Amino acid sequence: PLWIRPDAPSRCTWQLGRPASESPHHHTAPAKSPKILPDILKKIGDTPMVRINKIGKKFGLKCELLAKCEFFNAGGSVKDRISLRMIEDAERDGTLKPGDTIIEPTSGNTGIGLALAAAVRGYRCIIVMPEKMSSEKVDVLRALGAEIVRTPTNARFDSPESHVGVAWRLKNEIPNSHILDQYRNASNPLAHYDTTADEILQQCDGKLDMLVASVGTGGTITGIARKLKEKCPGCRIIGVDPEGSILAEPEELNQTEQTTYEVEGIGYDFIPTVLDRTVVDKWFKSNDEEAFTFARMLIAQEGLLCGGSAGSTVAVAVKAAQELQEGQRCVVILPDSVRNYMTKFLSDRWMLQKGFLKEEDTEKKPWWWHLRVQELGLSAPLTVLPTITCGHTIEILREKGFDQAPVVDEAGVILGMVTLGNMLSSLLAGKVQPSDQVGKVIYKQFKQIRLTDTLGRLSHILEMDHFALVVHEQMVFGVVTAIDLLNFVAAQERDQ
Amino acid sequence: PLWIRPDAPSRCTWQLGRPASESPHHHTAPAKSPKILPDILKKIGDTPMVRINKIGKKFGLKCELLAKCEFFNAGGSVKDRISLRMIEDAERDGTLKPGDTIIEPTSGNTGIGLALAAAVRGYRCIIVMPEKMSSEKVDVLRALGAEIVRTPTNARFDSPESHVGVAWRLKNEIPNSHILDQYRNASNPLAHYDTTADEILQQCDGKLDMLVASVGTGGTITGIARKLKEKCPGCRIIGVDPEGSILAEPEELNQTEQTTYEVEGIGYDFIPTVLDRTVVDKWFKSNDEEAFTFARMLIAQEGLLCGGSAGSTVAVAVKAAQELQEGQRCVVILPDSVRNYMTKFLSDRWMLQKGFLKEEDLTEKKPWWWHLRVQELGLSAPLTVLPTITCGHTIEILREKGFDQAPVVDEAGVILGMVTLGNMLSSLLAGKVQPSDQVGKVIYKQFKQIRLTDTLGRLSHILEMDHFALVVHEQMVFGVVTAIDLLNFVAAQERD
Ligand code: HEM
Numbered sequence: 005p006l007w008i009r010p011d012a013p014s015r016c017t018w019q020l021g022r023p024a025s026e027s028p029h030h031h032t033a034p035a036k037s038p039k040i041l042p043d044i045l046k047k048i049g050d051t052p053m054v055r056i057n058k059i060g061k062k063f064g065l066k067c068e069l070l071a072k073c074e075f076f077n078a079g080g081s082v083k084d085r086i087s088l089r090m091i092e093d094a095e096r097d098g099t100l101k102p103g104d105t106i107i108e109p110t111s112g113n114t115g116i117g118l119a120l121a122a123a124v125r126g127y128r129c130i131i132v133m134p135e136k137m138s139s140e141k142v143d144v145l146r147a148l149g150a151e152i153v154r155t156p157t158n159a160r161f162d163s164p165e166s167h168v169g170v171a172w173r174l175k176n177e178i179p180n181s182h183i184l185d186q187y188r189n190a191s192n193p194l195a196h197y198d199t200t201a202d203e204i205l206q207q208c209d210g211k212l213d214m215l216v217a218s219v220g221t222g223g224t225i226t227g228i229a230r231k232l233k234e235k236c237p238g239c240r241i242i243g244v245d246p247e248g249s250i251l252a253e254p255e256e257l258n259q260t261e262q263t264t265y266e267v268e269g270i271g272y273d274f275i276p277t278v279l280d281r282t283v284v285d286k287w288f289k290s291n292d293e294e295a296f297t298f299a300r301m302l303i304a305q306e307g308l309l310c311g312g313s314a315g316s317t318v319a320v321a322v323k324a325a326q327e328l329q330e331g332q333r334c335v336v337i338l339p340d341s342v343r344n345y346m347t348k349f350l351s352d353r354w355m356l357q358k359g360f361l362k363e364e365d366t367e368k369k370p371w372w373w374h375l376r377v378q379e380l381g382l383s384a385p386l387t388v389l390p391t392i393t394c395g396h397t398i399e400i401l402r403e404k405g406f407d408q409a410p411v412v413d414e415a416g417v418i419l420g421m422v423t424l425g426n427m428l429s430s431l432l433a434g435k436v437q438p439s440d441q442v443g444k445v446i447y448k449q450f451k452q453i454r455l456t457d458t459l460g461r462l463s464h465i466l467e468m469d470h471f472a473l474v475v476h477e478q479m480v481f482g483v484v485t486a487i488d489l490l491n492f493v494a495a496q497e498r499d500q
Numbered sequence: 501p502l503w504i505r506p507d508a509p510s511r512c513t514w515q516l517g518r519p520a521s522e523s524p525h526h527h528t529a530p531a532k533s534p535k536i537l538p539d540i541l542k543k544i545g546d547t548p549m550v551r552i553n554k555i556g557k558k559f560g561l562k563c564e565l566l567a568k569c570e571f572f573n574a575g576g577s578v579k580d581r582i583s584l585r586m587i588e589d590a591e592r593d594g595t596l597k598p599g600d601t602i603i604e605p606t607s608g609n610t611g612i613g614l615a616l617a618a619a620v621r622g623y624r625c626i627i628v629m630p631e632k633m634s635s636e637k638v639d640v641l642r643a644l645g646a647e648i649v650r651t652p653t654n655a656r657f658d659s660p661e662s663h664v665g666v667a668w669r670l671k672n673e674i675p676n677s678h679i680l681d682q683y684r685n686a687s688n689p690l691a692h693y694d695t696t697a698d699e700i701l702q703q704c705d706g707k708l709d710m711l712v713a714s715v716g717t718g719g720t721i722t723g724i725a726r727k728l729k730e731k732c733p734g735c736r737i738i739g740v741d742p743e744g745s746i747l748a749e750p751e752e753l754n755q756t757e758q759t760t761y762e763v764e765g766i767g768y769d770f771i772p773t774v775l776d777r778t779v780v781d782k783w784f785k786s787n788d789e790e791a792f793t794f795a796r797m798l799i800a801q802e803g804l805l806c807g808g809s810a811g812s813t814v815a816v817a818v819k820a821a822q823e824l825q826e827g828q829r830c831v832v833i834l835p836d837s838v839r840n841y842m843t844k845f846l847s848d849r850w851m852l853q854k855g856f857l858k859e860e861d862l863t864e865k866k867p868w869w870w871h872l873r874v875q876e877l878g879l880s881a882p883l884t885v886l887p888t889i890t891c892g893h894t895i896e897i898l899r900e901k902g903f904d905q906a907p908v909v910d911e912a913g914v915i916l917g918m919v920t921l922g923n924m925l926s927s928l929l930a931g932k933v934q935p936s937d938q939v940g941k942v943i944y945k946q947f948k949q950i951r952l953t954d955t956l957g958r959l960s961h962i963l964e965m966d967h968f969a970l971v972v973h974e975q976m977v978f979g980v981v982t983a984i985d986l987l988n989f990v991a992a993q994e995r996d
Pocket residue numbers: 013014015016017018019022023024025026027028029188189190191193194197226227230277278
């Protein structure tokens with residue numbers, strides 16, 4: 005019978021007040037990097053601490069809000085730490101021989117760290133992740149040379165179909181394969197103990213009041229909170245758990261209907277062995293809406309390009325830190341970057357689709373946002389045949405006094421655009437001949453519009469395109485670029 | 501008449517051998533960052549140098565190959581540098597007042613840097629970029645609070661339709677707006693001169709043989725090559741230009757048919773004023789296939805998550821560095837990360853769509869089982885249940901019949917999903933559901949169809965996206981396949 009419960013009780017004899025000399029675990033202390041890194045893996049760690057300027061003050065925090073930005077790691081997640089460590093330790097033990105297969109269950113960040121390290125070190129990497137997690141992760145992982153396996157998001161960790169289960173069963177079917185097991189492996193919270201904490205302390209000079217961390221596996225908050233209780237015992241430790249996860253305390257917090265949430269990387273249906281919950285001063289529950297709102301807010305206001313996990317974390321921070329007073333400080337952990345999330349919470353249509361945005365919140369938009377294209381008043385352009393030449397094009401455009409002609413067809417299909425400036429530039433530069441076909445100088449890419457369309461829609465199209473042609477369902481009523489819209493609005497600015 | 505040619509001749513009186521004390525320009529030397537960065541903008545610079553282990557040896561270079569990875573910058577591109585600089589300098593002149601609109605033409609990295617800086621400092625940002633550029637860039641930009649305008653990619657820099665032109669016109673229509681103009685602005689190559697180069701020297705101790713850089717605006721290669729000719733004069737400077745760009749020398753190299761290319765960020769139809777071509781010892785022409793092949797090779801082999809620009813640069817490096825002998829070194833510049841390119845060269849289907857990949861090669865790389873029928877697995881026919889059935893009955897039936905997993909079908913014949921003994925049991929036992937409850941609460945909704953005549957490779961892909969693959973006809977399921985089944989098959993064949 006081969007499986008090992010990730011929820012098993014911790015056999016660790018560590019307790020607060022124990023002399024650090026009693027530890028059986030092998031510790032490696034942070035060091036100084038050489039001028040030239042022998043491989044990218046040494047770029048893991050020494051992440052910057054950054055003051056949060058606008059947002060802290062927005063919500064009424066009187067204290068100093070710092071963020072440890074962990075998305076500057078090689079893989080761009082905090083997991084890159086524990087990956088490296090877990091492997092290195094595994095190499096010392098002689099457990100992991102070169103040319104051996106690694107298998108890991110993950111939210112996909114750890115999978116990334118491991119796949120990366122494997123790409124470097126020649127290990128064969130096999131990842132198992134739930135089907136919820138973003139496709140960007142899959143892309144990166146596949147690019148790294150990792151084999152990928154997915155599990156149902158709905159599966160309970162007991163069940164065979166859960167990522168852990170599948171992982172273990174694969175491990176049974178693959179010769180000379182190992183599972184580092186971030187849930188049971190000392191190397192994860194240890195890696196957070198030896199390095200991350202030291203970094204935070206050194207960066208804070210050793211003076212710190214409150215610390216906020218979201219908890220997936222607990223490793224981060226575990227190592228950090230332990231080394232903190234030792235070195236800066238006056239620091240409150242705040243855990244962050246998504247609703248639908250059973251991790252927090254007291255259990256009264258976990259009473260909820262929905263079993264699933266959109267945020268990736270945090271929360272679980274079980275208690276990981278590496279998690280020590282006794283070191284957490286208080287827990288806070290976060291939801292998806294909070295998370296994504298604060299992540300988007302974090303990017304837009306603070307310029308921190310970071311994941312939704314971070315969003316949750318700060319979302320809690322602005323509440324939990326309220327009790328603090330000026331002169332004090334609160335450090336927040338930001339786990340990963342937007343790179344994984346590109347198509348999800350960054351995309352407004354996904355945020356709308358998932359019900360994290362009410363269309364009413366039309367409130368943010370400028371006055372012109374709802375108006376018809378008709379209000380511009382436009383003009384009717386001149387159309388030409390595709391068989392026409394360049395020279396004749398210049399002739400006609402100048403003679404009629406038009407800068408731009410859409411190229412239409414006898415069939416009625418619009419093929420594109422030509423413009424006087426670009427025609428002239430091309431000929432003059434000897435790129436084309438006056439006898440040459442328009443078809444190359446032509447601008448192929450454009451987008452259709454109805455007179456009854458809204459100017460906002462125009463703005464979007466203009467975020468994706470230079471030309472917008474107003475049409476029916478055959479013929480073009482006008483030609484619009486950003487500049488036209490701008491002329492209009494500006495003209496309205498003077499009309500007040 | 502307001503426009504200023506980005507291709508204007510350089511009025512700079514700098515020439516090799518001039519004492520740096522003669523420079524009218526204001527220089528700021530690199531400094532040491534405080535423990536706590538006052539804002540994310542200070543995280544720009546001090547990018548790591550990293551040895552390239554596998555590829556250099558792969559292509560027969562005897563020398564030490566270093567890469568300055570500039571994608572660890574805040575915005576994730578080299579452009580973040582010149583962004584910050586351009587603003588700070590503009591603030592010294594008093595030219596840029598707080599609350600003023602910034603307008604910039606860009607390939608989009610510069611735009612990202614600017615949008616970021618503006619977001620932090622409260623400036624209003626307006627970006628203008630060609631329609632070639634990736635949508636990921638657009639996404640990040642929009643998240644940053646930047647307004648976006650696109651221009652035709654085929655547009656000549658002369659023409660009204662080019663990004664520079666559109667930018668200038670916008671400047672005409674907006675009150676109190678500035679254009680920092682990365683093409684004419686001293687601050688760009690100066691920023692590469694003061695910092696980047698210094699960093700490179702310090703990292704190499706001052707000992708360097710060859711330097712390879714791709715050139716979009718020239719700022720990088722210019723600043724760097726100047727400070728290099730001054731400090732380490734024996735260093736060869738190699739430019740990289742995409743085919744279809746006129747930047748290289750002698751002009752004999754620029755003779756080509758195609759006018760456009762997929763690589764973002766490098767090459768232009770004009771000669772930027774900040775570009776000094778006289779400091780470039782040699783030019784090399786790169787294409788798209790080279791670029792992407794080496795970018796993918798770079799990620800997979802070296803674990804460097806980087807853009808296609810970098811791909812071009814190394815693709816040249818493996819050639820240009822051939823003349824070197826062991827004991828020497830060649831430093832290569834890597835401009836940006838995969839975050840911008842996520843849906844393009846990283847995606848295999850896009851690489852196939854664009855003809856950068858011959859299917860023959862993919863079929864060559866693949867393992868032996870890759871082309872085989874699902875039928876060869878031999879499978880089994882599963883047992884199906886109705887959705888109105890309860891949980892208890894599900895367990896009863898499954899154990900009684902000796903099956904682990906059942907598909908849930910319909911009287912209509914529509915497969916609603918999957919149920920499994922393990923998850924049912926786990927569910928009940930954890931008290932999430934009741935024995936009298938309907939199956940759907942436990943049911944696994946997400947799966948994917950397959951035909952017996954499908955190939956095992958297709959299965960591998962699907963298994964990259966899905967847990968269950970149901971082999972079906974055109975109401976009947978011939979089988980159910982997971983990663984583990986495929987693995988049982990392969991393992992059994994390895995065993996024989
Ligand atoms: C004076 C300090 C410590 C002592 C004496 C100690 C002692 C132990 C012992 C005896 C075990 C069981 C060994 C085994 O059965 O394999 C153990 C397991 C473990 N310890 Fe510690 N430990 C200390 C500190 C820490 C710290 C600071 C961390 C994390 C930051 C940590 C994380 C773990 C983990 C994850 C395990 C594995 C739990 C398991 O396998 O069930 N320990 N420790």
